[PDB]
Design a protein around this ligand. Structure first.
Ligand SMILES: *C(=O)N1C[C@H](NOS(=O)(=O)O)CC[C@H]1C(N)=O
Ligand code: NA
Length: 247
């Protein structure tokens, strides 16, 4: 990233909901990004389910995921959310955010390869300690909104250290809104409600293509009650609607 510039006009969307959080928005490239909070833009948080993006790429690159038509079969044993109790494609597993599919991917990738790829991707603090199947859920890995937009820009441009076909496969799995005039790729996350005096984090990260332009975005907020979870999309959506990007 080049520079990060404060835009105070976005604060109103946070204060109206009593949300402590940050939005980072970059037109064309991470050369120039805007944010409501310079300090929070670079503060690092657990990635939670946003980690499915690098994890999917690493799974493909290592051959743990064979291709985009692989079916991750459900063994019929209880999973923590009922929407995960079914056979899933890669896109299906990302869209329903099926943690156990990605835990098994991570186990098969292994610590050595996982560390190597997070270094190649400059992914956050690159700290995978805490258990190979949970470091991004409750371990020591942390990433900022700025770093998310840098990582997503590389993915958009096919510039990550991975094959172009594998980056294209994961990008297809990340489409969340299609209109004739714009296309959104994105991923949500929610670490949990945290503990006393130590809130969890909620995320929405991605990019928007409109006309011949591209906008990279990353939102996070502190959260201690799950009723507030939809704000992770509604606050940044309102900002991007106000900017004329979506809608
Ligand atoms: C990811 O953050 N997780 C898996 C699943 N994600 O759905 S979300 O992206 O809509 O928040 C549920 C929340 C969370 C988890 N419990 O691990
Ligand atoms: Na939501």
């Amino acid at each position: 990233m080049g520079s990060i510039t404060e835009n105070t006009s976005w604060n109103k969307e946070f204060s109206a909901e009593a949300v402590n959080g940050v939005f980072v928005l970059c037109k064309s490239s991470s050369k120039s990004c805007a944010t409501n909070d310079l300090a929070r833009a670079s503060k690092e948080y657990l990635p939670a389910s946003t980690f499915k993006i690098p994890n999917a790429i690493i799974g493909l690159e290592t051959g743990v995921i064979k291709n985009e038509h692989q079916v991750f079969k459900w063994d019929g044993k209880p999973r923590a959310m009922k929407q995960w109790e079914r056979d899933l494609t890669l896109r299906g597993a990302i869209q329903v955010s099926a943690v156990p599919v990605f835990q098994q991917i991570a186990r098969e990738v292994g610590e050595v390869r996982m560390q190597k790829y997070l270094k190649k991707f400059s992914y956050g603090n690159q700290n995978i300690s805490g258990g190979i199947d949970k470091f991004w859920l409750e371990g020591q890995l942390r990433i900022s909104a700025v770093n998310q937009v840098e990582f997503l820009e590389s993915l958009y441009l096919n510039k990550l250290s991975a094959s172009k076909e594998n980056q294209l496969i994961v990008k297809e799995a990340l489409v969340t809104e299609a209109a004739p005039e714009y296309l959104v790729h994105s991923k949500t996350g929610f670490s949990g409600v945290g503990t006393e005096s130590n809130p969890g984090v909620a995320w929405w990260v991605g990019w928007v293509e409109k006309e011949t332009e591209v906008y990279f975005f990353a939102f996070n907020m502190d959260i201690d009650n799950e009723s507030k979870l939809p704000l992770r999309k509604s606050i940044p959506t309102k900002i991007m609607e106000s900017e004329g990007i979506i809608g």
